[PDB]
Design a protein around this nucleic acid. Structure first.
Lengths: 77, 91, 102, 96, 95, 91, 80, 89
DNA sequence: CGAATCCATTCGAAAATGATTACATTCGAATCCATTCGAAGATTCCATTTGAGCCTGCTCGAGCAGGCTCAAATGGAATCTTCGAATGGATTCGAATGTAATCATTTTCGAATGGATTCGAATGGAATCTG
DNA sequence: ATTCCATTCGAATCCATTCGAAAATGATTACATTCGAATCCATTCGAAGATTCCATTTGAGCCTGCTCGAGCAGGCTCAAATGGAATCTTCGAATGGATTCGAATGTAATCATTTTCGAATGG
């Protein structure tokens, strides 16, 4: 399902980042980086959910995990 | 029931800009900002009290925590505002 | 005759006292003049951020504040940018293009 | 047959995507990816929508910052094209 | 019979219980097995670090342990390096 | 008088390496390391207890805190050790 | 005390660079190194003096420096 | 001879800056915050250790940046880029 | 050879036992939201191929700036001496915070709408690639 | 001469500011008692001098390796057009799991004794 993050989406993210020219092997590197980041965050989100004896992942577990990682987020609680 | 900081944020906004409004998402962001800053100050004050083998938290601990946490040219004005408020409250 | 009116503020003093008394480890007391200091600090910071955001909004000929204006106001000031390192949901990035790319 | 020299439309999209504030990845593929990744930690989970949206916002911000650092590294070596080695150097210096 | 002897440990359980009780906010209670869990974790980590440092000392033909050995042991392991990111006064650098 | 973890560190060292000594500076390093880890675990456990609206700290909070902080295989091993101790304590 | 930043001589910077793994060094590195060292020292000493002043003392101890370092994220083992 | 110095200074553990000049610099810097101050030898030692570790790490990152651009000589550009990516300035 | 590591010891500070209460956590029900699932449709993004010019990598000549050697002088180390500056501990006391009742606010949640805010046009104001 | 875009008019649409009801919860008065100032006194401890061998630093010269600029060729990313997938929107039953409210237990904190232990000092 990692192939659902297409090449034009990476081009748009690069453009917002300020990149004028892009190589041809950037996309796979970006996909790997994104997968690693997502795994790291989701691990802690699920740990927080399991401690509370629940089966539904809420927004506050994600907020707490992001704050733990050092990536505080404003707007969701 | 649930408590938040919306009333006071709206009061301050109407105090500084009397013809400008706010939206709901900006209100949520402001609430998160206030909660975060409060948690930081409280934690630093507790640690400062623990270091010197004390039990009571006073305005000295708050002043030192503000001096340690806020960047320059923001610590001076904040300390001035707090000192003025305490002096008015006591008298 | 509320304590906030006596101090001359808008943020509460009793509620801040109650909140401070719940995070003081064990057998920890809280003085009555720590709440005044904390309320004054919070009000000052809120007024600063709101003033900058209102100026940024008025520069664009609109009558409301949105997270975009909050991000524009925060990232344009050095002290506020240094103090706040969180992610504002709905702000984007400040436009900037390198000289050698044009 | 009107044509644009290579490098103008790139600047046009740079301005267009730096002026806006929306999200750039589609929602359904990201939701599917999140579910597949999370199924390796606990079976038969459920997700609030707000959890997925928070994850998407964080991911997009992370990628944009990483691309800014990559562009800096590419400019250092007297180039305008970004390559995997710039990403590797930026991530190595940042501590990741 | 001390609680540590009942649990089969070397680190103290009463002292750790007293230390944990002085961190709970306002009226906060602490169980009796939290101290046992904490003591077990601390003893395990200490034993691992000491074992690695002693192996390095045996490699370097020295009977004693110096901060150089601790730095060599800590920086040579992936998880120990990940967990400990502090500065050791007297270690130097890894070649 | 002041408290320290010197005796227990020496006992553990005599358990692993029965023929090796340790200097004073390494002892100071180990004391600092133990204090750091203990403070981290205690803080995380307090936060976990607060998030769930509870007042008692139990072994479940310690287990979850250990799971969050320690990386990879270490955490797994640590958990096992702790569990064993508890089973030997209650019986 | 004036112009004491020039007591961080060229050989000392060369030794630190050699331990860092540097083969060749430009001639303009020393001023940059002195500037960055000054900034680092200023921040840490400011925090240490704040910690000392809170306790109503006149002597800067090792624990003030240890706490000031831990504040920035530069934890140091072996001094307290 | 440049590699011999690297091999010699990577194996040792002592300090590389002289003690008296560093102590004088520390006192001169601290003069700006409070007059008539006193120090302990332990405070100066801790400051020296921290400073040396910081500089060594910075020089490692600088060497990486210099190698990226196909060179062996380090310049101020590399220091500026390393401090910019770390988010120090 | 000597600067450090290890063992003997007496005593206060602190841990283990035994009742006793309350306080906090566990074990059924009963709504009732809110997440998973299935189906149909207009269209807007996305995937593939063709043409081509601009950016990247490599070679060669030239300058330039860093390392290596040597002699002379300098400023950091190293070992007492004086002292006078500053912590640190005891013992009152005086300032200040918590606890218990009793109101009288004050803040939170659920409807009502007039205005600031999205689509849909619009032609003026550039920006551009070819002459 | 061909496209593209900040900025300005309609238009149904949306949403932020008022307005009421009522349940927490501050604010006042009167004890009780922790807790932290305020003087005095011991002693470590940090600062300022004096006196040298000897190691470390600093100019001065030489020259070779390293970086820089220019002319070329080939690798390769961009721009445009045509089919064709598949996300987005809307609707509707079927289903699962948080959340609140009573009762019945499990367990941790608080005194009163007794006793084991580890921190400081020598050797």
């Amino acid at each position: 399902n990692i192939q659902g993050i297409t090449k034009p989406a990476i081009r748009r993210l690069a453009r917002r980042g300020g990149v004028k020219r892009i190589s041809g092997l950037i996309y796979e590197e970006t996909r790997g980086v994104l997968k690693v980041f997502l795994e790291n965050v989701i691990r802690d989100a699920v740990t927080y959910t399991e401690h509370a004896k629940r089966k539904t992942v809420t927004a506050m577990d994600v907020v707490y995990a992001l704050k733990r990682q050092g990536r505080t987020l404003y707007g969701f609680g | 029931r649930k408590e938040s900081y919306s009333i006071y944020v709206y009061k301050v906004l109407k105090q500084v800009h009397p013809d400008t409004g706010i939206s709901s998402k900006a209100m949520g962001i402001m609430n998160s900002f206030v909660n975060d800053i409060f948690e930081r100050i409280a934690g630093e004050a507790s640690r400062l009290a623990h270091y010197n083998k004390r039990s009571t938290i006073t305005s000295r601990e708050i002043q030192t925590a503000v001096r340690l946490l806020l960047p320059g040219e923001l610590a001076k004005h904040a300390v001035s505002e707090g000192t003025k408020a305490v002096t008015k409250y006591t008298s | 005759v509320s304590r906030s009116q006596r101090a001359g503020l808008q943020f509460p003093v009793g509620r801040i006292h109650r909140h401070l008394k719940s995070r003081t480890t064990s057998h920890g007391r809280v003085g009555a003049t720590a709440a005044v200091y904390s309320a004054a600090i919070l009000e000052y910071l809120t007024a600063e951020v709101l003033e900058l955001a209102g100026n940024a909004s008025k520069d664009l000929k609109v009558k409301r504040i949105t997270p975009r204006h909050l991000q524009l106001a925060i990232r344009g000031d050095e002290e506020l940018d240094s103090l706040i390192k969180a992610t504002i949901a709905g702000g984007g990035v400040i436009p900037h293009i390198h000289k050698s790319l044009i | 047959p009107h044509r644009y020299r290579p490098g103008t439309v790139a600047l046009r999209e740079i301005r267009r995507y730096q002026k806006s504030t929306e999200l750039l990845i589609r929602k359904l593929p990201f939701q599917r990816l999140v579910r597949e990744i999370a199924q390796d930690f606990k079976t038969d989970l459920r997700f609030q929508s707000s959890a997925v949206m928070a994850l998407q916002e964080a991911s997009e911000a992370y990628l944009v910052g990483l691309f800014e650092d990559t562009n800096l590294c590419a400019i250092h070596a007297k180039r305008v094209t970004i390559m995997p080695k710039d990403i590797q150097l930026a991530r190595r210096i940042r501590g990741e």
